Design a protein around this ligand. Sequence first.
Ligand SMILES: Cc1cn([C@H]2C[C@H](O)[C@@H](COP(=O)(O)OP(=O)(O)O[C@H]3O[C@H](C)[C@@H](O)[C@H](NC=O)[C@H]3O)O2)c(=O)[nH]c1=O
Ligand SMILES: Cc1cn([C@H]2C[C@H](O)[C@@H](COP(=O)(O)OP(=O)(O)O[C@H]3O[C@H](C)[C@@H](O)[C@H](N)[C@H]3O)O2)c(=O)[nH]c1=O
Ligand SMILES: Nc1nc2c(c(=O)[nH]1)N[C@H](CNc1ccc(C(=O)N[C@@H](CCC(=O)O)C(=O)O)cc1)CN2
Ligand SMILES: Nc1nc2c(c(=O)[nH]1)N[C@H](CNc1ccc(C(=O)N[C@@H](CCC(=O)O)C(=O)O)cc1)CN2
Lengths: 271, 271
Amino acid sequence: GHMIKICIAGKNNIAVNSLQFILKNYFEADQIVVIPNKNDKGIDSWQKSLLKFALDNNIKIVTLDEIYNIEQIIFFSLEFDQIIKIENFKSDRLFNIHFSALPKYKGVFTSITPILNNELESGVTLHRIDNGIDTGNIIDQHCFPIDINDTARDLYFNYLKYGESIFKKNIQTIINNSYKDLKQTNINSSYFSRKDINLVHKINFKKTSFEIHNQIRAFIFQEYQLPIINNSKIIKSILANEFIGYNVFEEFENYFIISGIDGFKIIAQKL
Amino acid sequence: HMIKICIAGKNNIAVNSLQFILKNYFEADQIVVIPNKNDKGIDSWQKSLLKFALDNNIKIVTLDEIYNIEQIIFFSLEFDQIIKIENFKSDRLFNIHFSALPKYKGVFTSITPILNNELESGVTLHRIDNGIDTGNIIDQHCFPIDINDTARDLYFNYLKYGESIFKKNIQTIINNSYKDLKQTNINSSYFSRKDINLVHKINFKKTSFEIHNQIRAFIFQEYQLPIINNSKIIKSILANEFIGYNVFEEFENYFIISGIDGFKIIAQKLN
Ligand SMILES: Cc1cn([C@H]2C[C@H](O)[C@@H](COP(=O)(O)OP(=O)(O)O[C@H]3O[C@H](C)[C@@H](O)[C@H](NC=O)[C@H]3O)O2)c(=O)[nH]c1=O
Ligand SMILES: Cc1cn([C@H]2C[C@H](O)[C@@H](COP(=O)(O)OP(=O)(O)O[C@H]3O[C@H](C)[C@@H](O)[C@H](N)[C@H]3O)O2)c(=O)[nH]c1=O
Ligand SMILES: Nc1nc2c(c(=O)[nH]1)N[C@H](CNc1ccc(C(=O)N[C@@H](CCC(=O)O)C(=O)O)cc1)CN2
Ligand SMILES: Nc1nc2c(c(=O)[nH]1)N[C@H](CNc1ccc(C(=O)N[C@@H](CCC(=O)O)C(=O)O)cc1)CN2
């Protein structure tokens, strides 16, 4: 019964493209509001800007305060930067797409944490927001491989793609309020906060090849940083099955050859 | 040569496995033993391999004395020395490692799988090569880490399943008719002594599952118990009752704790 039906809060391609899907299939611009993230400067770059799309397309920019009293508003967080408190809202139609295969890897830096912890797969999960961090009941989840030479930046782009997708898969039943959900288990639940990750990663070479490789490629996301070996930035790590002896470490002009305690060949490419 | 087999290592896995060969396969005369450096020659919370051997007129030797024995079966059962295979005339060199290889190579394997959130572990019979726990897998038996198992419980499961896999496989080892498969690069992990601080400092900005896991991974009373506010902890119980996020309350006999997802932990203080 209110004029505003939906708020998209967050950033990057996932937010912008999801918003474009709703504008095309579901709601007119004047039934939509957005809350861009604090660091959104309105500039299209290696990602699309939600603030810029909103301005371009005459969608009103609001704050949380302005939406708390809108009854029945659908609130959708797509890489939103604020932890909400659900008791502020009259609506209970509050959703998030989280970049991991919940209940694993709640929290932040989820293009880093699964790689660093030796996962072969990750996922995106659509869930209701409750007062905890990525703790709410799951509505849908899509799992996908972390390929053996995927970097954190590669995995991030997979989150964006599969996330956008899981949004489109589910938005109808969310708008109809006909969706199903299930509470998260206690077991397998894991969480990382910013203080658990040191973005200047010091590599522990007394590790297997797999682990050394994981350690490198988990911090490859050039827009933010690259890992450093012997004062050289690394742009790609390649892990092979080839046995080359234990604890190999050789610096060349364009790359390092590395093996860990199990002796499998890594090529770490310089930038 | 008269000597057919060396059993090297410690604890009930080594003693019972030796008793089983002495009963079914070889005479005392055909067996030599290398205890670990720390073997006291008395029974304690585990039986002494040194004592068993001396009690049964099985000769105690060093690695030097066996290198030259043609065709000897060398069988490590929690042995404390990394061998170098080119020292030996025989290539019949075997180990039972207490993990589900290729995961959790190295040490402290009753801690590492719990601390890294595993639901299961395993024992793995493999050939020894020059790396640590790297050689080809001959057999493996996987079993659960129950939700409230401690490191101590895990260890006693390794000794039991470890003894069993020895008994299952030993004839084919004697007859050299066993089969094996090289280990994969993927999923391979390793922990060395320096990776684990046996005086664990709990990170409470984690899930209840992780906090519980941190506690119970260090419960091994013969060595240490984890400490919370100066009380030693003997048992951690994780329930799927929601009690609020980030609870911490101390009582006389226990703590009530929840992490970021709010599930109830009871940490029982040692009596
Ligand atoms: C800031 C930063 C990011 N990254 C990489 C890894 C990150 O997973 C990826 C995306 O970073 P970004 O700052 O957008 O967020 P993130 O930590 O993954 O995601 C968290 O922060 C978002 C604002 C929240 O919406 C997310 N909430 C989800 O339910 C949260 O998981 O960029 C670096 O390698 N280095 C960096 O310094
Ligand atoms: C020394 C020590 C051990 N433990 C626990 C954790 C560990 O998994 C278990 C057995 O201790 P260990 O016998 O020192 O063996 P560990 O599991 O480190 O195994 C390692 O050392 C032995 C001697 C090798 O044969 C074995 N292949 C290695 O994996 O006891 C503790 O909790 N605290 C300790 O201080
Ligand atoms: N209610 C609630 N609000 C949400 C989500 C939720 O699922 N629950 N899902 C999204 C979560 N977004 C985040 C998640 C974490 C942080 C964050 O900033 N974490 C800090 C920790 C802050 C703290 O300890 O509380 C850190 O890692 O250092 C910020 C936005 C959006 N809003
Ligand atoms: N060849 C080789 N020898 C072996 C085994 C093997 O599968 N391969 N299997 C058994 C493994 N026993 C161990 C494993 C690790 C240590 C150990 O002492 N590790 C040190 C690291 C030592 C190092 O880096 O050299 C540490 O963690 O600080 C000792 C005995 C017995 N001997």
